[PDB]
């Protein structure tokens, strides 16, 4: 069965993200068939909790001939912030809906910048409410405004598919508008490279437990985050301290020996020659040369409200919070933007972080900020720095 792609609709409020979303599910339904669905029943997005953090999120699926799509759509700007930083709704591409009327509005920019921070790799634009727009080559000088903005945060604005349409008329059933819908589904099909499967990525395993087998080496355990480890392959141990190289002489699971550990599985991996006291929980095992240890990086951080597990009072830099990456805690110091001292609950900000030791990480790694025995923040690494 088909390859799976994660999209959702992003962009400023009441520009049409929710109607577009229903229009799609309703066009492709009357076209190829399947399930159509109601604006009413999409707009009133249910609450679901990603680790204490509550987000209002509707999840719609539709099918093109070549692809299955999981579409995410949210009611408030805040939902989009929490969802994007959190990973609760990772996207292989976003549909940026801009109203023909207003032009890029304040969330338009923020949803693009946040898309870059959080590692959304492709954006496709839909100029909406065109049925409202009456004459001229504004549609054209607006398709330019959207392009400079898009290139302003590093997306190929010049190469960007921009579809003009009316989500309402398309949902009402105007055939010439049901058209730009199907045209848009073509662009998801054509412009978003089908995403790499986890089992296809280089091997990575966050280390949970470590014990010796005397006379053989040491065993480290965890859930394979991605890739395949096969018996006989070299691996590295990365983070927290000096990288080391080893060979995998075996893989076990539930007391059974295997030829390999695969993404998704909890496994033991025996490392020949390595001794116990030189591996720490918090290190990772990884295909050699595919992930590096950094101590410094740039992230986007959302400060939890009290309701979702943090504090009703603002977070102040300068107190050395704990950053939690995969399996461990490690102290860091923060630099905030210029002039800013604190971050209000429910707000998000950019943070440059310097840890006290190295952690294996690339852009897009998630993490939690703790301080005083309380999870106060959720972050994503936007760019590794050293």
């Amino acid at each position: 069965t088909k390859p799976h792609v994660n999209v959702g609709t992003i962009g400023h409020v009441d520009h049409g993200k929710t109607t577009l979303t229903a229009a799609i599910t309703t066009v492709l339904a009357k076209t190829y068939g399947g399930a159509a669905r109601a604006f009413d029943q999409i707009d009133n997005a249910p609450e679901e909790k990603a680790r204490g953090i509550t987000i209002n999120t509707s999840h719609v699926e539709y099918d093109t001939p070549t692809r299955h799509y999981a579409h995410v759509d949210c009611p408030g700007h805040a939902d989009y912030v929490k969802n994007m930083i959190t990973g609760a709704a990772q996207m292989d591409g976003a549909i940026l809906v801009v109203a023909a009327t207003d032009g890029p509005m304040p969330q338009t920019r923020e949803h693009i910048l946040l898309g870059r921070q959080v590692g959304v790799p492709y954006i496709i634009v839909f100029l909406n409410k065109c049925d409202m727009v009456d004459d001229e080559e504004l549609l054209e000088l607006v398709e330019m405004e959207v392009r400079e903005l898009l290139s302003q945060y590093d997306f190929p604005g010049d190469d960007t598919p921009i579809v003009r349409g009316s989500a309402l008329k398309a949902l009402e059933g105007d055939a010439e508008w049901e058209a730009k819908i199907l045209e848009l589904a073509g662009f998801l099909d054509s412009y978003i490279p089908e995403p790499e499967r986890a089992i296809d990525k280089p091997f990575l395993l966050p280390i949970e437990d470590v014990f010796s087998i005397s006379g053989r080496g040491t065993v480290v355990t965890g859930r394979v985050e991605r890739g395949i480890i096969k018996v006989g392959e070299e691996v590295e141990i990365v983070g927290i301290k000096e990288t080391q190289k080893s060979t995998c002489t075996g893989v076990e699971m539930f007391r059974k020996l295997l030829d390999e550990g695969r993404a998704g599985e909890n496994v033991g991996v025996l490392l020949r020659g390595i001794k116990r006291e030189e591996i720490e929980r918090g290190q990772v095992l990884a295909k050699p040369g595919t992930i590096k240890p950094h101590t410094k990086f740039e992230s986007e951080v959302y400060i939890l409200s009290k309701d979702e597990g943090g504090r009703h009072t603002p977070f102040f830099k300068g107190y050395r919070p704990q950053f939690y990456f995969r399996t461990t805690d490690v102290t860091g110091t923060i630099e905030l933007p210029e002039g800013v001292e604190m971050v209000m609950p429910g707000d998000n900000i950019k943070m440059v972080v310097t840890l006290i030791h190295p952690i294996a990480m690339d852009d897009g790694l998630r993490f939690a900020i703790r301080e005083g025995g309380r999870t106060v923040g959720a972050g994503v690494v936007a760019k590794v720095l050293g």
Binding site: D209, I213, T221, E252, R255, N266
Partner: peptide, 12 residues
């Protein structure tokens, strides 16, 4: 190793 239904564990 050490596990056997679903926790972290192993052997080699």
């Amino acid at each position: 190793s050490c596990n056997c239904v679903c926790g972290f564990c192993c052997s080699x």
